[PDB]
Amino acid sequence: DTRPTIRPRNDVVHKQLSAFGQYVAEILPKYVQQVQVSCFNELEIFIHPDGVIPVLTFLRDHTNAQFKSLADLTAVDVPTRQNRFEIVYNLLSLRFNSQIRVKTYTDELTPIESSVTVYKAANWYEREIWDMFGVFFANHPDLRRILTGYGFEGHPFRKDFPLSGYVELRYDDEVKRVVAEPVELAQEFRKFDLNSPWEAFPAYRQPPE
């Protein structure tokens, strides 16, 4: 490597997953709005909300994909878009040692049919998203609160719930139990406005508006 600082790039992997992206695109062009390869050699599939079951089933049993290892499912909630909750899955195929990312979009109200039929791994990768974000997935076996206090309100990992939350616990003598109260902080979490006023990367520059 003549440039040890930079991460060496590979092209044989680059075009092959690029070709496979076209392959999946042709097979079912009903749901794939667009496919984006990455400089990190992580091709990603962008699907439609109704398309969750088809593509996920497709990569699961197809003879040229065999993507059957559900890596993770999460949300990338983006306020500035009308579909704030960006549901994304990660799939792994042992036979062809590749990782596929399928990305959707959803509002707070629109549901997504549960992927438990495709992968039962999602069973708990589904619960926390409903808790942490609030988006509800239809026809799922259970939508329980898994990563919050019992009776907790709202959805923390949204870009609306503040870091400190709204409710704080403390054990009180009168009631002989640890009761709640509106949060109060000894220290306010200080702000670090650290985004430089100088442009960083001309390559990823946002197009002019």
């Binding site: 490597d1 600082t5 930079i6 991460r7």
Partner: peptide, 12 residues
């Protein structure tokens, strides 16, 4: 973070 930064660690 190395992957996003397109920077590879030194061999040592």
């Amino acid at each position: 973070v190395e992957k996003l930064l397109n920077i590879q660690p030194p061999p040592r």
